[PDB]
Amino acid sequence: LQVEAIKRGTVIDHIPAQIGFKLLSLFKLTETDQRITIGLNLPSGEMGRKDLIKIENTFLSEDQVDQLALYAPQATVNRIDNYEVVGKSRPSLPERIDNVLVCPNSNCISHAEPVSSSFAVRKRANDIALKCKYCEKEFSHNVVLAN
Amino acid sequence: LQVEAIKRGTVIDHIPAQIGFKLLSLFKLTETDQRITIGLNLPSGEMGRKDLIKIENTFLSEDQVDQLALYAPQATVNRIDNYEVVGKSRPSLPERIDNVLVCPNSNCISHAEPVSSSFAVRKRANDIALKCKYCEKEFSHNVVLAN
Amino acid sequence: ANPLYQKHIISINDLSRDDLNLVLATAAKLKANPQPELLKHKVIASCFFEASTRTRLSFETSMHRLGASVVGFSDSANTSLGKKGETLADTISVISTYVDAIVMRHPQEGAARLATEFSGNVPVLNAGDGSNQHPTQTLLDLFTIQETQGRLDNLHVAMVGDLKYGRTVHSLTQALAKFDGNRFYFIAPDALAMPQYILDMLDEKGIAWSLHSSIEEVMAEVDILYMTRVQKERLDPSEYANVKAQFVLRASDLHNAKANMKVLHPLPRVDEIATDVDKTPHAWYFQQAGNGIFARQALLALVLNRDLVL
Amino acid sequence: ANPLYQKHIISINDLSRDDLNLVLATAAKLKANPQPELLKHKVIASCFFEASTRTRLSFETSMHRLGASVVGFSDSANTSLGKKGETLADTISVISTYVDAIVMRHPQEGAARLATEFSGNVPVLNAGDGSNQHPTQTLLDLFTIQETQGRLDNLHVAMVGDLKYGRTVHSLTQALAKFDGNRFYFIAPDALAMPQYILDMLDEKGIAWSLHSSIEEVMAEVDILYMTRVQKERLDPSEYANVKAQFVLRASDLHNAKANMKVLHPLPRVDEIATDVDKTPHAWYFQQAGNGIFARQALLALVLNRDLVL
Amino acid sequence: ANPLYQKHIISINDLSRDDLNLVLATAAKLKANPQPELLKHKVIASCFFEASTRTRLSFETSMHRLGASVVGFSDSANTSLGKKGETLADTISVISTYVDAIVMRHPQEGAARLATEFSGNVPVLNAGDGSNQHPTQTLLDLFTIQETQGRLDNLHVAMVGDLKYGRTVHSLTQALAKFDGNRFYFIAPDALAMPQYILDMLDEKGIAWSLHSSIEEVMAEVDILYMTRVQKERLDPSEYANVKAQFVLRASDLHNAKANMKVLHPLPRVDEIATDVDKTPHAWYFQQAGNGIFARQALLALVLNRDLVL
């Protein structure tokens, strides 16, 4: 392999192309002292091209794995221990996205006040609609920006 | 070698910790279809820890290399062809830096108007001096890097 | 305890049909048989961070009719939030150590919801948060619709004016959609249309609704003509073409109205309802406003008093 | 052509000693023997985006004394930049299609430099850019020192007041440092000290400078006492403790001055020079101002004429 | 005397094709061979009651290039009309006892026409009256089109942006319609369309014009692409949705333009022309502005001199 195996931690495989970097940026995954190995634009038999993120001595809860669903719905999260895959899971669409997004309603109380952002998530047509906990306005995920 | 050798392209080695991810942003390096491998928080002989970036079939622009001198003076840029290192160098401080930096003088005309930023560069032994072409004020590069 | 005891009252979206019916039943009871001492020994904050006549004065009157005391402000300019830079969060954190409930109106959407995250065990009652929700308006509206039509189901309801920014119609449409077989007519300028999240909610519930460009189209079949003011203080400057009321109801427009039809308006009105409407039997906006006392007494009783009033 | 023909005049940092001497020699000639038609058929823009009395009026008077015409503005409020949103860049782009030279003062540092990038073959003369440079002030300052002291070398020069924001002393210090053996005394509040880039330049050239907390310390040894106004329109609010003049020169303070010492001030003064100084033989700020005519004629003549023969 | 001697220049509607050609021919002559003393001993008033950069400065520069003197104001705030309640009528009545010609720009339509009724034998030149007419802009526009296209007939001209309030395109369309076989493309928001009185004139003369919702539709066929700024100081608040430029020309949009096509803009631009257009060979708005000098000298020369021989 071009990106070698790890002893212990999490391997996020099958990330769509151009999404791997977005995931590192959004979830601040590089803000750690743990060893990270990343492959971008790797070939895949299943997806064609794919990104890959490996984070040692770091683990993701089901909730944290679910947060990936908005960006990599068909990703695989491998829990590694003693060089062994001891668990595989796929992201499921979460009930909400907290902290990382910014409400696009400029008159929302969330901008002025010391609260964390929070949006309810639902499937609308073939899109993802986000409804702000505070202002209750609803937006396409496309127009809800990150911090 | 966790991240293995490549055929043709660029290997930026000896990037200090917590800088590698910043380089991927600033230089839009992931905005390509070229295969990329990244090691963050790798052990290092001379540095203890380091970041490492490999880009296949790709080379840096000039001054983008001399932008490197600001963010990572100790970094090593390797030019690779046919699996061999054929160009190896550390980026030296340029005289001038354009476009990427922001003058910290809030009353500088460069904020309000459609011109490109431009700084003259010189070393003061304990930091780098950046001098704005427009306002003629001089700053430590520590202060300019808060764009 | 009754289902609403110590509950926050933020959004109609958080309330069920049973909740709404409970408030109205309680309102009917207190109207027939006042309980002047029900909330004796309560102190309630009335905190208005934007303008109000009806909502603040009827809430405070209701508090006194129930024997409770009132503290607060009708203007934020002379609070420490107004002058010393204090957050809304800290304002709620201290006020909630003083009072048994907080009634608040605020110009930013989501303010009431935020307050609940800092008020501890003290209930927050949303008297309006930006262009979002206005639950107690909806309670009095429902009471008024029920009074004049005899039911809350199988009604033809037209809503006119600024539907985009009307917290009134956001709340009211959600409420009536919890009842069966209601039909909606939306008469708005395109720039101030009913928001998509409301329409999607109607579609999921199989509720019929349609857009119309005139009151006359639907006058013959409406039971409730709910008129609204253009919310000019919420408009973007790019929406300034709609400042002036696009639909003006006058007495001659009511010729083919059903006998039972009532004209409602949460008020204040500018010109969207001509004064010649006032004396016709269809005008019910002042009666509506007076119903705010019964609805708001009811809500206060249910939130602050453990047992059901009978 | 003379070395200054068709050159932008932006910063003293771009000028050599020879350039400065050339202007001074030309100034002395014009003062002695006027050339009323030297700039006949020239039209010059006088563009002031912040306030001025001396710099604008002497510049324009200078243009008229040489026979040039003048267009421009003293306020930006009624330009298309003031009312229609036009950038400075575009402003320079069109004005430079009209005139033979542009004189500009502007509240932002760098504005004059930026103008040179849009003015094509039209020379720009910096009448002051924020707190950065003030080249023509330095020209008249040097001229006045030369006149009164007989030299620009081996002087003892004190600069007093707001040295941080004084574009006058930034330009003047750089100019005097191009000459030999000058010694500087900086008397300023800590918050408004002479900036480090100036001091570093003095160090690199092996020029002696020192800080002093009073005029009295240096009165007996100075040839030139250069007073400045606190640049209150430039102060950050955090610097407002420095608004009042900290150093106030009065006639009584001159008792131990060298007989040849002159008090200069680019003007306007607020209170840093009391009016009882005006009648002493050391007061020379009005004569200095008057010299703006000869320096500015000299500069205009050299930029817009290839050759001058006296 | 020449046909324009001592004539008011108020509206393109009062000028013939021959009049326009005369100014253009005179402009070309003066550009090629300047006449520095043509208006010696003339004094001209430059009276601007609203903002200007190009029109005022080029006009005044033009006066100086021909040897005339200038008096006037760029702000009405310090005239007796600004502070003492004086009418425009009386203002014109006295100023016309001083000067040989009056150049005036004013925020109200008709102001220039009104001035002619109080100025007696003194010619008035309209530098812009509200959203009505802008004759001298049209003169320099025509000159620039003639220069770059070699002709004023059989052109394909696109006008983009605020055509309702653009006094520039009102005058320019009327002028080009005096020539043969010109074809017009109007690209504007519905709220700011080219007014009906313009269109009717085009119909009466059998001139083809059409509306288009994009520049792209017509890019391949236009000789002149005339961009305009949204006249926000003229907008009714009901029209505020149109404040941002709806059509934004970028360098990439020029890919299928005729090689000879020129982009014009009377200026200032806000965002309707991106700065990356400036370096393309099609950008000609700064050259256009520069041509204001020759058109305005030409006009002044023809109004104030009986005869010119080159």
Ligand SMILES: Nc1ccn([C@@H]2O[C@H](COP(=O)(O)OP(=O)(O)OP(=O)(O)O)[C@@H](O)[C@H]2O)c(=O)n1
């Ligand atoms: N010590 C290890 C073991 C596994 N992996 C990585 O974990 C991912 C998936 O593990 P594995 O089940 O062994 O591979 P696959 O069978 O291909 O899994 P899948 O079918 O889901 O793609 C691979 O990217 C592999 O490189 C790793 O980085 N370090």
Ligand SMILES: Nc1ccn([C@@H]2O[C@H](COP(=O)(O)OP(=O)(O)OP(=O)(O)O)[C@@H](O)[C@H]2O)c(=O)n1
């Ligand atoms: N085909 C190749 C050749 C080299 N490398 C990488 O390029 C970097 C520097 O090349 P090399 O000179 O071979 O390593 P060093 O001798 O350690 O160089 P240095 O002294 O700079 O550490 C190393 O990180 C190595 O992994 C690579 O990725 N692909």
Ligand SMILES: O=c1ccn([C@@H]2O[C@H](COP(=O)(O)OP(=O)(O)OP(=O)(O)O)[C@@H](O)[C@H]2O)c(=O)[nH]1
């Ligand atoms: O941990 C890994 C996994 C994969 N790779 C690199 O990615 C490519 C695929 O190697 P894989 O073996 O992991 O992919 P795959 O066959 O399992 O097919 P998919 O499940 O991804 O659809 C190869 O180019 C390999 O070098 C790594 O470098 N490291």
Ligand SMILES: O=c1ccn([C@@H]2O[C@H](COP(=O)(O)OP(=O)(O)OP(=O)(O)O)[C@@H](O)[C@H]2O)c(=O)[nH]1
């Ligand atoms: O291409 C590389 C280079 C280095 N590494 C990883 O980096 C670590 C260091 O291995 P190196 O061999 O690259 O370090 P070094 O001896 O050259 O000493 P320095 O130049 O860094 O001072 C090792 O843990 C190795 O796995 C890679 O994975 N890939």
Ligand SMILES: O=C(O)C[C@H](NC(=O)CP(=O)(O)O)C(=O)O
């Ligand atoms: O303002 C409106 O038009 C409707 C509604 N009106 C009221 O609540 C009545 P008031 O503002 O007097 O309390 C509101 O949303 O505030």
Ligand SMILES: O=C(O)C[C@H](NC(=O)CP(=O)(O)O)C(=O)O
């Ligand atoms: O303003 C000062 O105190 C010094 C200096 N003063 C002048 O140039 C004189 P004026 O502002 O009247 O043209 C300046 O920088 O503007």
Ligand SMILES: O=C(O)C[C@H](NC(=O)CP(=O)(O)O)C(=O)O
């Ligand atoms: O203002 C415009 O957008 C077009 C036109 N512009 C001009 O005349 C240029 P200026 O306002 O700088 O004299 C006008 O009508 O005033």
Ligand SMILES: [Mg+2]
């Ligand atoms: Mg696999």
Ligand SMILES: [Mg+2]
């Ligand atoms: Mg090495």
Ligand SMILES: [Zn+2]
């Ligand atoms: Zn929100």
Ligand SMILES: [Zn+2]
């Ligand atoms: Zn700067």
